Amino acid sequence: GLNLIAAHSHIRGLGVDADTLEPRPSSQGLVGQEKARKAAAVVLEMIKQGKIAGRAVLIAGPPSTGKTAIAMGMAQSLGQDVPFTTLAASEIFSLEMSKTEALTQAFRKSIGVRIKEESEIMEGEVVEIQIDRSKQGKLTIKTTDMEAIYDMGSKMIDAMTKERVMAGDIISIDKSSGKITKLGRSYARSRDYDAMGVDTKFLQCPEGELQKRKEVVHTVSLHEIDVINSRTQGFLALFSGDTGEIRSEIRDQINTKVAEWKEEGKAEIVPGVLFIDEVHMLDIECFSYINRALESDLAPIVIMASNRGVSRIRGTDYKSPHGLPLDFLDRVVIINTHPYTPDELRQILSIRAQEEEVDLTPDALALLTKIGQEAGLRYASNLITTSQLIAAKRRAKQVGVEDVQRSFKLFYDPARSVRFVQESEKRLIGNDGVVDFSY
Amino acid sequence: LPRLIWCDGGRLDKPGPGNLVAGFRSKYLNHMMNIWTPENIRSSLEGIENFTWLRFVDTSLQEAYRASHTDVFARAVDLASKQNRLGHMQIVYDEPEDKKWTPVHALFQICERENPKAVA
Amino acid sequence: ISEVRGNTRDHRTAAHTHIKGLGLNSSGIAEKQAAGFVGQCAAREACGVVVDLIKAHKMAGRGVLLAGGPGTGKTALALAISQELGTKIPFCPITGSEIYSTEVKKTEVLMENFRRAIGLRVRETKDVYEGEVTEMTPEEAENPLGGYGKTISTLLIGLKSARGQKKLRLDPSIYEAIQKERVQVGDVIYIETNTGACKRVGRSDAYATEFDLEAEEYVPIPKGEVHKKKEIVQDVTLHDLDVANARPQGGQDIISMMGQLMKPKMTEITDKLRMEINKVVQKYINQGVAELIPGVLFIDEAHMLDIECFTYLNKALESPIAPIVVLASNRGIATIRGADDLKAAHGIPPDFLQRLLIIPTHPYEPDEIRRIVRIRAQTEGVQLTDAAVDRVAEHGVRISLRYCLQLLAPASILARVNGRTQVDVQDIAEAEELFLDARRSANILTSTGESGGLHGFIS
Amino acid sequence: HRTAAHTHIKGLGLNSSGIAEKQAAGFVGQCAAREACGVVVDLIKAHKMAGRGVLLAGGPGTGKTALALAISQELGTKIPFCPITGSEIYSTEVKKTEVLMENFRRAIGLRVRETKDVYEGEVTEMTPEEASTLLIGLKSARGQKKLRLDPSIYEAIQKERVQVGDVIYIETNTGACKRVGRSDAYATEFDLEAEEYVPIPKGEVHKKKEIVQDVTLHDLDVANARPQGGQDIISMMGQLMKPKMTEITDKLRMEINKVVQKYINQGVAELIPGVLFIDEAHMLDIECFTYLNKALESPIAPIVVLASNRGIATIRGADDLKAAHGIPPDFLQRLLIIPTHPYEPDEIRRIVRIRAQTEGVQLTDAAVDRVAEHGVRISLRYCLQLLAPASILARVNGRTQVDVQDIAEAEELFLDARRSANILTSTGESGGLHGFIS
Amino acid sequence: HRTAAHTHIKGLGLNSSGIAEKQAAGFVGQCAAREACGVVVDLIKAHKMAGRGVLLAGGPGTGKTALALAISQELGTKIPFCPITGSEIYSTEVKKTEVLMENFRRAIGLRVRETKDVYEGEVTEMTPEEAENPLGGYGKTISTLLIGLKSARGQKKLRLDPSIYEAIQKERVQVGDVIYIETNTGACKRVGRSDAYATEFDLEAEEYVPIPKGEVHKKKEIVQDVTLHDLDVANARPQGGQDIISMMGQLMKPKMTEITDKLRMEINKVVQKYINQGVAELIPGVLFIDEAHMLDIECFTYLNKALESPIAPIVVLASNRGIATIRGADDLKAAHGIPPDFLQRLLIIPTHPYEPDEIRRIVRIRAQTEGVQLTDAAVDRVAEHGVRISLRYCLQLLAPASILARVNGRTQVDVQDIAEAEELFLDARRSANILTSTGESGGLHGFIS
Numbered sequence A: 001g002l003n004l005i006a007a008h009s010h011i012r013g014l015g016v017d018a019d020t021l022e023p024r025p026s027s028q029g030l031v032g033q034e035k036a037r038k039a040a041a042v043v044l045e046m047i048k049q050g051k052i053a054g055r056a057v058l059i060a061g062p063p064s065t066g067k068t069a070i071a072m073g074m075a076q077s078l079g080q081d082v083p084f085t086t087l088a089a090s091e092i093f094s095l096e097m098s099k100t101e102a103l104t105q106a107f108r109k110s111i112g113v114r115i116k117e118e119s120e121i122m123e124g125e126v127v128e129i130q131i132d133r134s135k136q137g138k139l140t141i142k143t144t145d146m147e148a149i150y151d152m153g154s155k156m157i158d159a160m161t162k163e164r165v166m167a168g169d170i171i172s173i174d175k176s177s178g179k180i181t182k183l184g185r186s187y188a189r190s191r192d193y194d195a196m197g198v199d200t201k202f203l204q205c206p207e208g209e210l211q212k213r214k215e216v217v218h219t220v221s222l223h224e225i226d227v228i229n230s231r232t233q234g235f236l237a238l239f240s241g242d243t244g245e246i247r248s249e250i251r252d253q254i255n256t257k258v259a260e261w262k263e264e265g266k267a268e269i270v271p272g273v274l275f276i277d278e279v280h281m282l283d284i285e286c287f288s289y290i291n292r293a294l295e296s297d298l299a300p301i302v303i304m305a306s307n308r309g310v311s312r313i314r315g316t317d318y319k320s321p322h323g324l325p326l327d328f329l330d331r332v333v334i335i336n337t338h339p340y341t342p343d344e345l346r347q348i349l350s351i352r353a354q355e356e357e358v359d360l361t362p363d364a365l366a367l368l369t370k371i372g373q374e375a376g377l378r379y380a381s382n383l384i385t386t387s388q389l390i391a392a393k394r395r396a397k398q399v400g401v402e403d404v405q406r407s408f409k410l411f412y413d414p415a416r417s418v419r420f421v422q423e424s425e426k427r428l429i430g431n432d433g434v435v436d437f438s439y
Numbered sequence B: 001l002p003r004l005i006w007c008d009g010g011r012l013d014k015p016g017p018g019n020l021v022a023g024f025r026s027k028y029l030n031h032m033m034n035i036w037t038p039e040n041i042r043s044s045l046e047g048i049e050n051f052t053w054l055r056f057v058d059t060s061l062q063e064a065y066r067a068s069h070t071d072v073f074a075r076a077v078d079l080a081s082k083q084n085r086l087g088h089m090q091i092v093y094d095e096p097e098d099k100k101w102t103p104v105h106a107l108f109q110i111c112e113r114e115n116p117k118a119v120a
Numbered sequence C: 001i002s003e004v005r006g007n008t009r010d011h012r013t014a015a016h017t018h019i020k021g022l023g024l025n026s027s028g029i030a031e032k033q034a035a036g037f038v039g040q041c042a043a044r045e046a047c048g049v050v051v052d053l054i055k056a057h058k059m060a061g062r063g064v065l066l067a068g069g070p071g072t073g074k075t076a077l078a079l080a081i082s083q084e085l086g087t088k089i090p091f092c093p094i095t096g097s098e099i100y101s102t103e104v105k106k107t108e109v110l111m112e113n114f115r116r117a118i119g120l121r122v123r124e125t126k127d128v129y130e131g132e133v134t135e136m137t138p139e140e141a142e143n144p145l146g147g148y149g150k151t152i153s154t155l156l157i158g159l160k161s162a163r164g165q166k167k168l169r170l171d172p173s174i175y176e177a178i179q180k181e182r183v184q185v186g187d188v189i190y191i192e193t194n195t196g197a198c199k200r201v202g203r204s205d206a207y208a209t210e211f212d213l214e215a216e217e218y219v220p221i222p223k224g225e226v227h228k229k230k231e232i233v234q235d236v237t238l239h240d241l242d243v244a245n246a247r248p249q250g251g252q253d254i255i256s257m258m259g260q261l262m263k264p265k266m267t268e269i270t271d272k273l274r275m276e277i278n279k280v281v282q283k284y285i286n287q288g289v290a291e292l293i294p295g296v297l298f299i300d301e302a303h304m305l306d307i308e309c310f311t312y313l314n315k316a317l318e319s320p321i322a323p324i325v326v327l328a329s330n331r332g333i334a335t336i337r338g339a340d341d342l343k344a345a346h347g348i349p350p351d352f353l354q355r356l357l358i359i360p361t362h363p364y365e366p367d368e369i370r371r372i373v374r375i376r377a378q379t380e381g382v383q384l385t386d387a388a389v390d391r392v393a394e395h396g397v398r399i400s401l402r403y404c405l406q407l408l409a410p411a412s413i414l415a416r417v418n419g420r421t422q423v424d425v426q427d428i429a430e431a432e433e434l435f436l437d438a439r440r441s442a443n444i445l446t447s448t449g450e451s452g453g454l455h456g457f458i459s
Numbered sequence D: 001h002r003t004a005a006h007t008h009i010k011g012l013g014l015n016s017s018g019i020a021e022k023q024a025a026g027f028v029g030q031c032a033a034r035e036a037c038g039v040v041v042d043l044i045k046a047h048k049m050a051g052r053g054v055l056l057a058g059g060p061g062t063g064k065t066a067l068a069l070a071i072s073q074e075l076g077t078k079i080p081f082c083p084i085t086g087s088e089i090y091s092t093e094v095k096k097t098e099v100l101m102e103n104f105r106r107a108i109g110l111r112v113r114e115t116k117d118v119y120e121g122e123v124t125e126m127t128p129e130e131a132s133t134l135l136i137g138l139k140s141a142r143g144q145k146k147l148r149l150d151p152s153i154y155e156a157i158q159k160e161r162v163q164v165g166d167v168i169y170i171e172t173n174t175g176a177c178k179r180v181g182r183s184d185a186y187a188t189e190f191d192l193e194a195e196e197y198v199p200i201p202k203g204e205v206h207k208k209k210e211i212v213q214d215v216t217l218h219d220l221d222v223a224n225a226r227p228q229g230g231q232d233i234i235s236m237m238g239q240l241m242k243p244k245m246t247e248i249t250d251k252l253r254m255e256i257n258k259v260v261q262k263y264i265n266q267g268v269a270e271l272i273p274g275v276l277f278i279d280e281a282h283m284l285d286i287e288c289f290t291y292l293n294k295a296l297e298s299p300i301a302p303i304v305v306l307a308s309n310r311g312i313a314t315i316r317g318a319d320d321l322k323a324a325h326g327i328p329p330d331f332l333q334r335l336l337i338i339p340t341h342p343y344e345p346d347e348i349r350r351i352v353r354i355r356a357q358t359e360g361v362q363l364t365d366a367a368v369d370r371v372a373e374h375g376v377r378i379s380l381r382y383c384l385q386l387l388a389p390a391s392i393l394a395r396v397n398g399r400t401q402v403d404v405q406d407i408a409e410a411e412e413l414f415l416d417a418r419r420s421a422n423i424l425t426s427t428g429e430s431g432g433l434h435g436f437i438s
Numbered sequence E: 001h002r003t004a005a006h007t008h009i010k011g012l013g014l015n016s017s018g019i020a021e022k023q024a025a026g027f028v029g030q031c032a033a034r035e036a037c038g039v040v041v042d043l044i045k046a047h048k049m050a051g052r053g054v055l056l057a058g059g060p061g062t063g064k065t066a067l068a069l070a071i072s073q074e075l076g077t078k079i080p081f082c083p084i085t086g087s088e089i090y091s092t093e094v095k096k097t098e099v100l101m102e103n104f105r106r107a108i109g110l111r112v113r114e115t116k117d118v119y120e121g122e123v124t125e126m127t128p129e130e131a132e133n134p135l136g137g138y139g140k141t142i143s144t145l146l147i148g149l150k151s152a153r154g155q156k157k158l159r160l161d162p163s164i165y166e167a168i169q170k171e172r173v174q175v176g177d178v179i180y181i182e183t184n185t186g187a188c189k190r191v192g193r194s195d196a197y198a199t200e201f202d203l204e205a206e207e208y209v210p211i212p213k214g215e216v217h218k219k220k221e222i223v224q225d226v227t228l229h230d231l232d233v234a235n236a237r238p239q240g241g242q243d244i245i246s247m248m249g250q251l252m253k254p255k256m257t258e259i260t261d262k263l264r265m266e267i268n269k270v271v272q273k274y275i276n277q278g279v280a281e282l283i284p285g286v287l288f289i290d291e292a293h294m295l296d297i298e299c300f301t302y303l304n305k306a307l308e309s310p311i312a313p314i315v316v317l318a319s320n321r322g323i324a325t326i327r328g329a330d331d332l333k334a335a336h337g338i339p340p341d342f343l344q345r346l347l348i349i350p351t352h353p354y355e356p357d358e359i360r361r362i363v364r365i366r367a368q369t370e371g372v373q374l375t376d377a378a379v380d381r382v383a384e385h386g387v388r389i390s391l392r393y394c395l396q397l398l399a400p401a402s403i404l405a406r407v408n409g410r411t412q413v414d415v416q417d418i419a420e421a422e423e424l425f426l427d428a429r430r431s432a433n434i435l436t437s438t439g440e441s442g443g444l445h446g447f448i449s
């Protein structure tokens, strides 16, 4: 369908024994990284238990060591039941709001408010409207399965007039609010006219009982309640963005009321996760805010990933490990992801080939594993798709070594590319702009 | 300006002969494949779905749809008709017995239900 | 409608949940451990005088600096000050990072928070009649006006509450409100005596069954008295008065209503407005109808402020109406954010530092760290063997207080996962191995990122 | 038609087997790089894979943009190809990571096969049927027709000032309608009126035609983010009211993906993921590559092709880090890298001959020789730029073809940057009255 | 009335032959520069030239700005004199080259004859007439208004376009009001009530005004002074119509906009029609860019093109700086802080330091300008400064010394009152010594570096 195959599509969960939290050598698509998966599972336990507010966990390791994959597996294993805000650090450098507001919003996104509600909605096809004046009227509605006549009040006849409700229309009436909505017209009326207006759409007739009392569970972010209270129709800003640096006194009211809802049992607070990928792209002004942001009772658990060594923090000229302030790193616990052995590469490349529905020969998978050792996991992974397509060009049944060899011949790995850049430095634009275009 | 530009389809949004795109594109982008149409909203109204909150914002699917298609002037004219009934509730449903009552379909209008402006 | 949940009202635990106050005698002397604190007896006693400074309404525009290394409890002390003041006094915490708005100049953002930290308490009487309309009935006048044929001298309205009903005789001019508001028998309304007008809340839910369909929601009968006369106490900040004057909310024209449909962008509130607000406030204070209640603006990581923020604070603190400012800083001797040629202690300009009462916060002894581990464990609900306590406290000496407190929850998970209702050394020895500190990780970096390489860290 | 820089590039020139022909489709050489681009074409047309990155790497003038426009023509017009430069994303409206998102979604197409029922005729009758429904009579030279109109399309017909005797255009199912004019059968209803009189339509009053409509996922974003076109008239005020870009939420784009998949399941729409091509990728900064790194992991993302001509160079926004291609090594691991190489003298000769006949220039053999000599010793781009001036000079000498005389004149009227730098070095030796400004 | 730095300057003080009188019109000396500024005044008054550049070059306090303000007085009130500093160019609303163009067109004036075609009368009838529209949803609309206007010379009945009735309605006109209607704009003004029925007992605080004398329809003509920039701003932010865009454009916040070359070019066509119609005189003026060293290399590179425009004012720059770094171009140093490209375009009027007897003369001119009656020994004292200290420090002492003398009960300033003024009010150099001596080491009482 519309979901194509991606880099983390094979990641289906965190792959641990739910009893002992012991990882197993592969499951749910993950391979190796056992201590990191066990640590991630220990974090996932305290996410799900939810009482521990505002912990910060850093996933640290070289490129292509499963830091993002583990973050995906944790989100899959956490399920839909808990908020999982996924934020690239680049997203915080907004032009429409300050970086602290952009962090505040991402924090607010990660706490759910859960409400369960029952409401009466009457839905059906209009059969007739009848009106008397001397105000009163009668409404006939059908489903496929019922027809009934309802007395309409004066305000209800006005609403019918304002909405231009005809026979053959499908209407819904929320009895709790009283407001009519028109869903469309019944497809039976497809022959009622020769030409139809732009805003007209056909529907199947509603089915079953006319008025239903479904029980529904609602979970909304604290960020959604903020944006809804930002302005008179702030809910539209949930989609266009188009929102200010929201006033702190609005959030102050909202937090106080959400506590009342939890005291009264109207709602359950569902604290979730914020995952900040490439957190080293934040700056000293972000990090010093995040220190205070983690102080709140309504702070999520924050996961973050970095591949930086000892490297300069942004917004300053001194270096530090991970590119992060030591004042910040003091508040963090760190999970380290290691390189992969050839046997763990051989497994991951098989999992990718299955997800990509590529039938590697055993020799191709062996050669592809050597490339993964010699040229990196992502490059050997990217040769799978390339060798499949090249095999298809020769109508081959399976990807042979010759299809991987040609894939390796056509597309350079990073190291072979850097070698090419060094070998042709005068033909390439240098860091001082010099180049020679001649032969 | 020549009528070829100003009338006969050099305006991309104006449907007619020549401008064969505008008539299709208006229907599909504003109605069929438009998330704010009530049939699309109604499919997204529960659980973790993107309109879950619309039960507790005081708008109906019809008002949400209107507010997403009419411009800021037209929406402001519609505001002129409305009554600030949540501000009156702040005067009446005061007491512990009233539990600061609010209609549950307006639950998320916290700052309208609690605002000194009404009391002052 | 909503399906209420019967489950227990527990609470989440954060890094400061154990702190409950400053823990002082009535003589103001710090108790060696109390209210969640261990040690810092000097800094707690100093904060106790600051607490009494704030509760005495002589203070204006004083400054405090909490000075000390990271992990030394400066934010804990600020929160404890806030808890000692309680909810009736504003405490407005921000970081210096929050001042770099995109939407107004940062001196406006700071002056907003400066005025947020100043409260006003206004007492007024609410005086209304309220109920479901039991009746409306004209009284025909004794002396009708010629040519009209109808002349009403009184309109009578019955209002019922849950607690009774009253026959209410009203000046006939209320016809204007009723006819505009479309009040009917069975609607819930109130009458306010400062206008004699009426407003409609909705139809009484006693009539929710009048029709199979009607297009309004019903509202409950007012559960109070039919007549309310109450004093009402309003929590107001002076920043609320700024915004309420600088962007009026209720305007019924198209530009107002278009304005309220678009994002409420901050604006650079004039000093002329703020200075007139102050004058009218001081008038009502002198009338005794309002209390000023100045509170605390707390700025954490105040070394993130720049020299433009600090030079404005000079003027701001000199205002005759101003909160106390409490700063916290950990920046040694460091370059001023906006004056790269200038280094100073705490990262605070020497010009401004001379204004502040500095409070130093010192490190913790090995036995204080151990007592903090005990306090933290029982707050998270974790329970430890004494050998687990001593192992956690030893990491507190060798690594950091914060790291050891962050080991408690992981080890509690691993203990219960292993079937143990209390954590032991075997779990601590495992939590400390899944979850590294910054130093052990920095060693992994220092060994692995010695060069570029296929598996190297990126420097 | 006009001749731009690449109009000779017709495609990749690959064999049935996918091997490159040494001169085909207007390419010469780059065979190994054309074959690699062929596999990228197969990757795109398979539409199985999201978010694979490709990098084109090699010196300036080595054909990196010929190769990108050859792909665009192997894909044809159906598949969306969205080109940008890495400098385009520094919008002042919204954060550059929003601009990247909008460009990713322009690279994913959605195809609807739409049937248009058009009624165009003179309005012979307008009979309101209810008191809502209208019946309208329409006439062409070839007959008349009656239509039942829903009150919605009626009021559209009535919002336009249609009357009996007017000529109108109606689209039956889109609900679009236009007043074409007044029928010239009424042209003498007065001797002067402020009215436009048009002949009666002379074909069928009814036409049915099938139009394969293309939109993109970004078009759905924009339509759903804000009222568009005639929905927002107050936009005429400008300032606050104009249609500014805003930082679209992923809530919206996720909810758009839901609706779009619904219409794919109905079979109404066909999804067509395509290509986002970013030239001068070295103009992207470290924050952009940090975003691209995530965005390429979404399940929808197009194939991204990048070009760079930098050697080892500082990445923008982090001068502390120098990397090959100017691409962070973190992100470079994610890309399939295709190298491009300099051209042999004999390859330059062939490219000169190919483009000459594409500009319509014709050369003597010695004229090809002398131009090719400038290609080798100076630059391929310089020698090709000689061709048009030399043709003008030959024309005004009355000659049918460019000869050595006309190139030896062109090369002296129009210097390369190298000889121009020599002039700057000799003349800007001092800040004198006739010196160049240093 | 208030006395400021240049109140003594009245003009260039030239002879009819264009030679400078050594002391005239408030000046002392600068004669060669005053003569060069005279020839510039001739260049301006002779309309024929566009986009010539003049640079007043010379150290601070050499009267460069006095020369520019003297030019502004020799040109008189008719010619546009448009002074700006280079620091005014950095707008937050629009690019800095927009502000330059606005100032270039503000420095070109137009005097134009205008006929205002108007109706004036007491409203004696007002009767709206309306149509039931088809169902557009907004309901009925007024199709026209019939209004009766009464003047002294009888009366007329007007059937107004409803667009003009909206002007009448937003003006809150009533029957019995006196109104002015301007058929140029469709705009309306309620002048008052009639003096008929002008009874006292209105809370409304009405202005009753007499019935308009003369005919009810009038066609008065008036001469308007406008700049080209006034036309640009009028046409970029339209506000004179009764249409919805003009209406809402009065409710929106005013903001500057980057007016296009396309608009400016088409307003040249419009103004040239007024010239060919004989209703306008084009009167090009001068732009004085003070502190022109505060411009930047983008400003200066734009000025190249702006001065090449087929109409542009005369530009007078002033700069006080030696060989200095060009702002925005830290690689490039040049004299005056002006790029070597741009300096070639200008005629430089160098300006020189004053002699001690000139300082004495200026001190006496300045003293009597402020009304400071000052003894000759006191003049000599003040003129020892200006030699040993800046000239400005002399002139600034005259006011304190006057205060101190009058506080001492003196009618006139003695040497004593200056010697006290010298002590209370230091020059920069004596204060710079206090800094270096007190801040010779850090401490509690040190100056902050």
Ligand SMILES: Nc1ncnc2c1ncn2[C@@H]1O[C@H](COP(=O)(O)OP(=O)(O)O)[C@@H](O)[C@H]1O
Pocket (backbone or CB within 6 Å): A007, A008, A011, A029, A030, A031, A032, A033, A062, A063, A064, A065, A066, A067, A068, A069, A070, A348, A351, A377, A378
């Ligand atoms: N342990 C693992 N099991 C399965 N797939 C993995 C594992 N580690 C990495 N991958 C896959 O290899 C690629 C790179 O790993 P990823 O975690 O995305 O890089 P990084 O470590 O830089 O975040 C992705 O496709 C990812 O899904």
Ligand SMILES: Nc1ncnc2c1ncn2[C@@H]1O[C@H](COP(=O)(O)OP(=O)(O)O)[C@@H](O)[C@H]1O
Pocket (backbone or CB within 6 Å): C015, C016, C019, C036, C037, C038, C039, C040, C069, C070, C071, C072, C073, C074, C075, C076, C077, C372, C401, C402, C405
């Ligand atoms: N004296 C103390 N007693 C109890 N807990 C403390 C004390 N000092 C610090 N803590 C706790 O240890 C951690 C470090 O203190 P904190 O105030 O965050 O340091 P800093 O002021 O450097 O940010 C916090 O969780 C805090 O609650």
Ligand SMILES: Nc1ncnc2c1ncn2[C@@H]1O[C@H](COP(=O)(O)OP(=O)(O)O)[C@@H](O)[C@H]1O
Pocket (backbone or CB within 6 Å): D005, D006, D026, D027, D028, D029, D030, D058, D059, D060, D061, D062, D063, D064, D065, D066, D067, D351, D354, D355, D380, D381
């Ligand atoms: N392989 C090729 N065959 C024929 N012409 C080419 C080839 N490569 C480049 N050209 C021509 O030379 C010009 C420069 O190529 P281009 O792709 O712009 O180089 P780059 O983008 O690497 O700087 C193109 O406009 C094209 O006309």
Ligand SMILES: Nc1ncnc2c1ncn2[C@@H]1O[C@H](COP(=O)(O)OP(=O)(O)O)[C@@H](O)[C@H]1O
Pocket (backbone or CB within 6 Å): E005, E006, E009, E026, E027, E028, E029, E030, E058, E059, E060, E061, E062, E063, E064, E065, E066, E067, E320, E362, E365, E391, E392, E395
């Ligand atoms: N030739 C002069 N005659 C009279 N007053 C002068 C003369 N030159 C300068 N002044 C006065 O001296 C003061 C300083 O001159 P000013 O024009 O400010 O110099 P600059 O603008 O070059 O700094 C002003 O009060 C000015 O009027």
